[PDB]
Design a protein around this ligand. Structure first.
Ligand code: SF4
Length: 215
């Protein structure tokens, strides 16, 4: 089983480079699972505080599957504005919530295949939902940050072209106890250091170990 060189120390350096650091009240674990899924569906192209503001405005009215289905599209749009792609997210949340009401007893699904079939729910959100809502490690949630950093550090046997290719390559060697945590670490690492353009390699602890920085 192939594994990249120096990956242990590289992850140690990413842990040291992170910046400085609440938990919300849920009426029941079942309602929490729905709100966990909704926050994942709202975060696309959105700063975390804007997503939290939308979640706070939804909770202030009562954030359940039934109350969402009783909220018309225009009202739901004003509530989640200005999250990115808010008009599409209104459609995704209403259609998903109707699926959960009809077929899942108001709960969220408990498998990746069923989650990614929901409107506006991709494999990245599905693996995060499995970990956060059900406590299940089903896979690695690969966004553009994880895909870029894994290829810069050569954490894949060969360079991958798509995020789900990166997921399959990372899961072949990455220990399973790190599958959930690696998403939050690399997302932050890509946001503050390993930038999409002009990465801050001069101030990165991985420069002497990074194949991208060395060539
Ligand atoms: S040296 Fe540059 S490319 Fe390599 S991990 Fe650090 S920021 Fe990313």
């Amino acid at each position: 089983v192939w594994e990249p060189q120096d990956w242990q120390q590289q992850l140690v350096n990413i842990r040291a480079m992170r910046n400085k650091k609440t938990e919300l009240n849920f009426s029941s674990p079942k309602v929490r699972r729905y709100q966990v899924l909704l926050s994942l569906m709202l975060s696309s192209q959105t700063k975390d505080q804007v997503t939290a503001g939308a979640m706070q405005r939804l909770r202030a009215r009562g954030l359940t599957v039934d109350s969402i289905l009783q909220t018309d599209d225009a009202t739901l749009g004003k509530l989640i504005y200005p999250v990115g792609f808010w008009r599409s997210k209104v459609k995704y949340i209403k259609q998903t919530s109707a699926i959960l009401q009809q077929h899942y007893g108001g709960d969220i699904p408990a498998s990746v295949a069923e989650l990614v079939a929901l409107p506006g729910v991709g494999p990245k959100m599905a693996h995060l939902a499995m970990a956060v809502a059900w406590g299940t490690v089903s896979g690695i949630a690969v966004d553009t940050h994880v895909h870029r950093i894994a290829n810069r550090l050569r954490w894949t046997k060969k360079a991958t072209k798509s995020p789900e290719e990166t997921r399959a390559a990372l899961e072949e060697w990455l220990p399973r106890e790190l599958w959930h945590e690696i998403n939050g670490l690399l997302v932050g690492f890509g946001q503050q250091t390993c930038l999409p353009v002009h990465p801050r390699c001069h101030a990165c602890l991985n420069q002497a170990l990074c194949p991208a920085a060395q060539g």
